[PDB]
Symmetry: C2
């Protein structure tokens, strides 16, 4: 039951973990763990309303997080992505996106994180081309260091922060045309 003299202690970890279950009433999850080649782990596939994003931790592609040297053991992961892309129509555009953390670049040839990220995304794009993706469906982008995923306090988080993302989308304009036709017809301005 209870002591006859009840003296509550300070709020503790029991009370933290009980209230540490708070979350959104409508908890939807638009990410799934992805498996490249039945052996390529830590990747995720995310859906957003304008497209799909395949997120690849640094270590699935590059020999390190401050280099654009593709780890040759990982060439087969890029081949698998190329194969799947070749199963999409030529309508689909593929944007390879590079990201870095805040690691100092003085020991490398890179002068900026934007530059490092650009070279990483470019190299991945070029390997996709080697494996047959039409260059007319590809582009590369750099975000530099300012879109982190997690604090940079573990190897796993560092690999996420230095990820490459592959974004799949189209340039559909049917709704835009519809509005344009209506606007031209009805707006005096």
């Amino acid at each position: 039951m209870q002591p006859v003299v009840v003296i509550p202690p300070d709020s503790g970890k029991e009370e933290e973990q009980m209230a540490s279950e708070s979350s959104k009433p409508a908890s939807q999850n638009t990410e799934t763990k992805a498996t490249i080649a039945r052996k390529g782990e830590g990747s995720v596939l995310e859906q957003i309303d304008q497209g799909s994003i395949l997120k690849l931790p640094s270590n699935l592609l590059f020999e390190n997080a401050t280099s654009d040297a593709i780890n040759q053991d990982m060439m087969l992961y890029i081949e698998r992505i190329a194969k799947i892309i070749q199963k999409l129509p030529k309508r689909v555009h593929i944007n390879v996106r590079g990201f870095t953390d805040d690691t100092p670049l003085v020991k490398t040839r890179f002068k900026s994180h934007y530059e490092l990220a650009a070279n990483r995304a470019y190299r991945v794009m070029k390997v996709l081309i080697q494996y047959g993706v039409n260059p007319n469906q590809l582009s590369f982008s750099s975000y530099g260091s300012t879109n982190p995923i997690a604090p940079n306090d573990s190897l796993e988080n560092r690999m996420k922060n230095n990820r490459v993302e592959i974004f799949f989308s189209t340039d559909a304009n049917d709704l835009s045309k519809i509005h344009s036709i209506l606007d031209n017809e009805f707006n005096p301005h």
Copy 2:
């Protein structure tokens, strides 16, 4: 049409705004921004234009992401410090991005892209059409995922 004349220079350079279903594209001709099509030296004359674009950006919904896209015609580069169309297009986009940052656009909302000589706006069949392909395009979008979340919830409840 989904393309409309965008008045920037007011000198008939050819700037245009296009709407597509997942965002907006401001298209800026080479001559507007750059000293030539073979390099990334911005026209100091036109810093005014990028500044204007930076001001307008800070009026948009806070969820907006801005991607500055670089493109080239498919003519050889044989003369300069640039070793590929991808590299030249990346540098041109980078420079426009950096000016936007200089005029107050948050770096967290900015990225730059290169398409090299792919995805031409006009066939590379005439001198003037080639030059059109040296434009920069600024794409405005968001990473909205409400619909995606809706579907995931329904799928989780009814599929598994």
